[PDB]
Amino acid sequence: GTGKTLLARACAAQTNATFLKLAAPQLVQMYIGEGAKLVRDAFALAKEKAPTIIFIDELDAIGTKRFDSEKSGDREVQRTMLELLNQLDGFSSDDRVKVLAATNRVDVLDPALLRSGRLDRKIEFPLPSEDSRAQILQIHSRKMTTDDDINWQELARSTDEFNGAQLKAVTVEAGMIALRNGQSSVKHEDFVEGISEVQARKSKSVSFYA
């Protein structure tokens, strides 16, 4: 929820190159050694239409830290991880063709997966900073009613430990408050009560000491 998916979709479609739609959970299939074949057809499609960017949605299906296994169907899962490495192996006309990949878990990805030659750039997306939070609010608010009572630098400070998707849930939930009123206008107050909707709490702490 830091807007990985959205950036990729947007800026790949912006520059002009082949945008492949490929999913990690897809690569594991119920038929033996067909799942491997499907990695080979994806790279084939990239090589005809090269340069291509292959945006892989998720990366944690094949982002398996196991290929030392015991009595399981897991030997099919890790087989299509190894096939990914063989089709990121140089083999000619593959320089042009890249892989974008979004993931939510880096700690379970393989150490042969993540390392140069394959994934070269390892770019981190943090929880958005105080200013950065502010910026996201105004960018959703440019599609809906905006009042000059509102001050977006106030709201930013009072959101403490809000990721960008939670900040879509400040701005959405403000319009939920505005409708429940029966207003045909959103006020600045509705946004404060938009902050109270998600917090990962319901306005609590649970303690037997304070």
Identify the residue among 4, 47, 66, 188 touching ligand ATP (CB under 6 A): 4
- Residue 18 marked ligand-binding: no
Alpha helices in 114-163 (DSSP H): 130-140, 152-158
State yes or no: residue 158 binds Mg ion (CB under 5 A): no
Q: Which of 141, 30, 143 is nearest to 77 (CA)?
A: 30
State yes or no: residue 106 binds ligand ATP (CB under 6 A): no
State yes or no: residue 168 binds ligand ATP (CB under 6 A): yes
- Residue 164 marked ligand-binding: no
- Residue 122 marked ligand-binding: no
> Residue 60: which residues within 8 A CB-CB, separation 6 or more?
24, 103, 104, 105, 108, 109
- Residue 2 marked ligand-binding: yes
Q: Cα Rg for the chain, rounded, in angstroms?
A: 22
Nearer to Mg ion, 54 or 155 (CB): 54
Binders of another protein among residues 130 to 189 (CB under 8 A) are 143-145, 163, 165-166, 168-169, 172-173, 175-176, 178-180, 184-186
Identify the residue among 39, 43, 64, 88 touching another protein (CB under 8 A): 64
Report the distance separating Cα 59 and Cα 101, nearest Å: 7
> Residue 14: which residues within 8 A CB-CB, separation 6 or more?
none
Binders of another protein among residues 113 to 132 (CB under 8 A) are none
State the binding site for ATP: 1-5
